[PDB]
Every structure is written in structure tokens, then in C-alpha cells.
Amino acid sequence: TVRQDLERQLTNLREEFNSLSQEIAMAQLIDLALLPLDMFSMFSGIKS
């Protein structure tokens, strides 16, 4: 049939997010926070 893929997990990926945090700015996180993210908006732009 298919071996579709293996998929990363929390244990493998939390260190990636730790190492990904430092690129995050703060002058526009406020704007993103102010914009109301609904079920549509938050998942609209996942990997295209």
C-alpha cells in the first residue's frame, strides 16, 4: 500500500521549539495577539 511517513512527536520536537523561540520578535507579537484568531484563521496557513 504505502508507508506514508513517520511523524515527529512532542519528545522529539520540544527541543526544536526551544531552539526556535529565540528568533521570535516582540513588537508585532502584540499585533498578532490583538488580531482575534478563530478556528479558520489559526489553521488557515499551515504549510500551504
Partner: protein
């Protein structure tokens, strides 16, 4: 743990060696070849009288013979309060010797595993599966989310990737976060899911043979020579035992009391 506040100017206390020798027990695990080469059998009494000179009361020393390293690895119960494991080394026993040293030197928290039904993961870097028995031959098969094995057929056991064969004791690490199906000889070998907590203060391993080869930590990078992994060269078991007796202050100093609120009752040779 609740805080404990102490000064940096309080005077050092007195030596606690006499108190610990009077209150504690020492216990030596040696291979049968030790007694065989000694060619005696009043020697336990002789060594007890010898320890008494340094200050271990008469009943405080317990000599627990074990057949050999691999056969001792299965279910090692350390019936004591200070444990010394003399451990002779021969080539090709490197990994099993290291396994036993890791097992006893490191503290563990283990839970049962039901191989027949569940697919099991590994929590992380401190998690392993330890299999003990007369003969363990674990065969693992990793899976997808759709339960289609990679490099193996989940229904056929031949395709499975063997990671240990015919071993009395096997500490298997596998890739963390991937479900595995296991095949291990349930009648003979019992396998348990364990987490490696901090160290065990109670046990010291005196390697008797060759190079500093023990690697307790499965991580390839760190190979730290912990203090309780002692080593000594040898030709005569009598010389080995005399060395241990004469330096027994240093050995128990290297060790320390065990601090863990256990949950598995078992026999102890306390006073």
C-alpha cells in the same frame, strides 16, 4: 524537598567511621572461581576476623557467592547495606559486564510490560527496557501510525530486527517515540519498562580484569568514570581480597547510604 539552611562556619563534626561500621553491614559478591582458587573454606571466617580488626563487628560482613557475571545478572538482589561486587573481566563479556554495572550502579523505576498486547514506546533518554531471564531473545519491530511495520511485517516474526539473543540480561534502548512490537519468549524471559533515576549510593563495582571499559551510560558521548566503578589488577584472589579488606575504608567512603523511598519489599541483611 523542603529547604535546609546551614552556616558555612560551623565546626566539622567528628569521624563517623566507627558509628557507621558499628551500625551498618558490608557484603561482597564474588565469583565461584574465587573460592575455587582459594582452595579453602575456613576463608570466610578468616576474612571476617580480618575485617573485625579494622572495625567491622563479627556478623557485619556477608559473603554472597555468585556463579558468574552473566548468570548473576538475572534478578540481582543485593541483600545488604553496603555492597561490593567483585567483577572479573574477560573479552567478549564487555557489554554484559557493562550492562550489570549500569543496572546496579544506577537506580531504576520499573513497571511491567505486556508484550502480547500493547505496542510500547520509550519515554526518552532515561528510559530503557530491561529483560531478565534464563535466555532472552528480544525481537523488535517498529511501526507507523497505521500499524504497518518498517523493516518488518507486524504478523511475521522472522522479519523482526533482533537486538539481543540468548542473553541472561539485556538492557535495550531503541529509537524514542516510535511504537514497537516485541517478541520475547514470555515463558523464559521477563521484560520491564524502566526509567533511570539518579545513582545508587549503595553499590560499588570492583572490576578485576582489564581496561577501563565499562560504559554505564548508553549515550555514546558521555563515558564518565564515576567513583564507584573501581578497578584493580590481579593474579591471586587472596591478594584481591586482602586489598579490599585493607582499603575497605576508602571503598565505603566512595559509597554512601541509599536514599530512596522504595516500593518493592525484599530481604535485607541489616543489623
Amino acid at each position: 524537598n523542603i529547604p535546609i539552611t546551614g552556616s558555612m562556619d560551623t565546626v566539622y563534626s567528628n569521624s563517623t567511621r566507627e558509628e557507621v561500621f558499628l551500625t551498618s553491614t558490608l557484603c561482597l559478591y564474588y565469583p565461584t572461581e574465587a573460592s575455587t582458587q582459594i582452595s579453602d573454606g575456613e576463608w570466610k571466617d578468616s576474612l571476617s576476623q580480618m575485617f573485625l580488626i579494622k572495625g567491622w563487628p563479627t556478623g557485619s560482613v556477608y559473603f554472597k557467592e555468585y556463579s558468574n557475571i552473566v548468570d548473576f545478572s538475572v534478578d540481582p538482589q543485593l541483600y545488604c547495606d553496603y555492597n561490593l561486587v567483585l567483577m572479573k573481566y574477560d573479552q567478549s563479556l564487555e557489554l554484559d559486564m557493562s550492562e550489570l554495572a549500569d543496572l546496579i550502579l544506577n537506580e531504576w523505576l520499573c513497571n511491567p510490560m505486556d508484550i502480547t498486547l500493547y505496542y510500547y514506546q520509550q519515554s526518552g533518554e532515561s528510559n530503557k527496557w530491561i529483560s531478565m531471564g534464563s535466555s532472552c531473545t528480544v525481537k523488535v519491530c517498529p511501526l507507523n501510525t497505521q500499524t504497518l511495520g518498517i523493516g518488518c511485517q507486524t504478523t511475521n516474526v522472522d522479519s523482526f530486527e533482533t537486538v539481543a539473543e540468548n542473553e541472561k540480561l539485556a538492557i535495550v534502548d531503541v529509537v524514542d517515540g516510535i511504537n514497537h512490537k516485541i517478541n520475547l519468549t514470555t515463558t523464559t524471559c521477563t521484560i520491564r519498562n524502566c526509567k533511570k533515576l539518579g545513582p545508587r549510593e549503595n553499590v560499588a563495582v570492583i572490576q578485576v580484569g582489564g581496561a577501563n571499559i565499562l560504559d554505564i551510560t548508553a549515550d555514546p558521548t558521555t563515558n564518565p568514570q564515576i567513583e564507584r566503578m573501581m578497578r584493580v589488577n590481579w593474579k591471586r584472589w587472596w591478594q584481591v581480597f586482602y586489598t579490599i579488606v585493607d582499603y575497605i575504608n576508602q571503598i565505603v567512603q566512595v559509597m554512601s547510604k541509599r536514599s530512596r523511598s522504595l516500593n518493592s519489599a525484599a530481604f535485607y541483611y541489616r543489623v
